[PDB]
Enzyme design. Structure first.
Site, PDB file in Angstrom:
ATOM      1  N   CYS A 100       3.300   1.891   9.557  1.00 33.21           N
ATOM      2  CA  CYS A 100       3.110   0.694   8.711  1.00 33.21           C
ATOM      3  C   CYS A 100       4.477   0.126   8.311  1.00 33.21           C
ATOM      4  CB  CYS A 100       2.227   0.979   7.508  1.00 33.21           C
ATOM      5  SG  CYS A 100       0.487   1.194   7.958  1.00 33.21           S
ATOM      6  N   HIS A 120       0.841  -1.226   0.000  1.00 30.75           N
ATOM      7  CA  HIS A 120       0.000   0.000   0.000  1.00 30.75           C
ATOM      8  C   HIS A 120       0.870   1.268   0.000  1.00 30.75           C
ATOM      9  CE1 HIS A 120       0.204   1.176   4.278  1.00 30.75           C
ATOM     10  NE2 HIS A 120      -0.297  -0.018   4.686  1.00 30.75           N
ATOM     11  N   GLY A 163       2.846   6.513   9.491  1.00 25.93           N
ATOM     12  CA  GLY A 163       4.249   6.224   9.223  1.00 25.93           C
ATOM     13  C   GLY A 163       4.788   4.984   9.947  1.00 25.93           C
TER      14      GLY A 163
END
Lengths: 302, 302
Positions: free
Chosen positions: B145, B41, B143
């Site tokens: 992930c 993603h 931030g």
């Protein structure tokens, strides 16, 4: 989102951990530059610990009585000396992984990370508070003495704690890195009283602010109080008194949430007087006091 | 003594954390040998996430559209591919800090450490369980992930989790390091149902054994039970069924304490049926299920 008791990344500290052996006692040392710091009680036998004269015990010890291991490499001890309750072993190699560091003496109610180590090998990491009575509720088995507590500010590792003793009550006592005990404790195996341990009020409030930020708002009420009235209730439940300094420290969390600090105190007052009624806050069935306002802001702003 | 939720030392993992940027989106990658692993993603804009066709989105990307930074060190991306829900970016340089590692897909009820990282920089470390419903209750902001979960056996890091999503309920979902989601979750901003969040019975039992070893004995009663009878109670309280495999895993703790597993089950049964009466066990006012039997043994044995 979400809210967890979170320790600092331990990498910079792992590279400073060594094994110190003196006779049959093995414990942990901290290797910064060409000095290994460890509890002085490493010199003592189980018998010595009842009533040790460290000055006399140290004098009888030689450099060759101290075995120091950094993993597979044995370090050569070229000198030894005593600063308060910490033993400083001078070694012939500076630690090339020495991070930027300082030694700091923390205040009661402040938090730090503990790198729990077994005979020089890092085993795990957890966040602790220095209790108002200068104990910590840690996890230290045999071989975990000399494990250190620290905070990481920016580049610098701020070392604040070295583990020395488990009290007969099963709480833990230790020193700063200059070897001065937190609290009234001594490195002698006697019965030692810890003070009454109070709850860290300012931290409970901070954690209530964390709860709101994370969507847990049930305990919010439309009462308020004064500092003075709140403290009458605090005293009764063995909470530390709240001061204006504490209110000031909670300012950013108050600003973020639009909840005045004395309004949060009124919520806390009700929770103290009525209990939690089998409800939870941030997954806890009791009021948590091991997050500082800084800790909350750090984790809510990232 | 003492008993605390503790994470593995994070040093070996910190050395593998990198920042990955694609367009305006930045997150964390994991750099092992000459491959950087991250959530797919990263290619998506906030808008794309509602309904992304990753295959089509990825096709508009080239090697040079991926900016990878390890601290200050720029990595050159020489290939990219998608494996399930993870992007694999091939880089010119092998990570010199690559530890011994495995990829493992953990079982529900197993625990692991999370190194929470902001845009490639380690922020904190905490212990999680993979819930029976394949969610975790973590702490992840923007931030974070691509932060990873792991266990360390000796020198080998077993990576089991990469963070991808916060569900609208505020719990977290992610993948193994082959990019397969734990549970039914997808990397799309839709409503997604997590199952009933059942309690990990074998872990609650392990922790009761830890309590006994540490001297917290009040809940021990004079009853016993059978697996079948205990499970009728478990089913009612949304506890996972207990099996003979679970009983076997508890063997060492039973041996240490002299308390037969089915006797401990009868204690748990009474705690379920009668509650805890506002008492605590190992400092907790509820029954804790995020220590495995391994976790307990590791911390009680030494």
């Amino acid at each position: 989102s979400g809210f967890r008791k979170m320790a600092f990344p331990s990498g910079k500290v792992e590279g400073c951990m060594v094994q110190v052996t003196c006779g049959t006692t093995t414990l942990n040392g901290l290797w910064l530059d060409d000095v290994v710091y460890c509890p002085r009680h490493v010199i003592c036998t189980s018998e010595d610990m009842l009533n040790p004269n460290y000055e006399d015990l140290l004098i009888r010890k030689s450099n060759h009585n101290f075995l120091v291991q950094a993993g597979n490499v044995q370090l050569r001890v070229i000198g030894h000396s005593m600063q308060n309750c910490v033993l400083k072993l001078k070694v012939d190699t500076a630690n090339p992984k020495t991070p930027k560091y300082k030694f700091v003496r923390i205040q009661p109610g402040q938090t730090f990370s503990v790198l729990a180590c077994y005979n020089g090998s890092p085993s795990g990491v957890y966040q602790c508070a220095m209790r108002p009575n200068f104990t910590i509720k840690g996890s230290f088995l045999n071989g975990f003495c000399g494990s250190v507590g620290f905070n990481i500010d920016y580049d610098c590792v701020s070392f604040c704690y070295m583990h020395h003793m488990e009290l007969p009550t099963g709480v833990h006592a230790g020193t700063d890195l200059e070897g001065n005990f937190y609290g009234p404790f001594v490195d002698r195996q006697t019965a030692q009283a810890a003070g009454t341990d109070t709850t860290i009020t300012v931290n409970v409030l901070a954690w209530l602010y964390a709860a709101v930020i994370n969507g847990d708002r049930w305990f919010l009420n439309r009462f308020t109080t004064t500092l003075n009235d709140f403290n009458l209730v605090a005293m009764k439940y063995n909470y530390e008194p709240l001061t204006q300094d504490h209110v000031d420290i909670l300012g950013p969390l108050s600003a973020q949430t639009g909840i005045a600090v004395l309004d949060m105190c009124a919520s806390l007052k009700e929770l103290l007087q009525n209990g939690m009624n089998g409800r939870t806050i941030l997954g806890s069935a009791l009021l948590e006091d091991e997050f500082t306002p800084f800790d909350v802001v750090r984790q809510c702003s990232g």
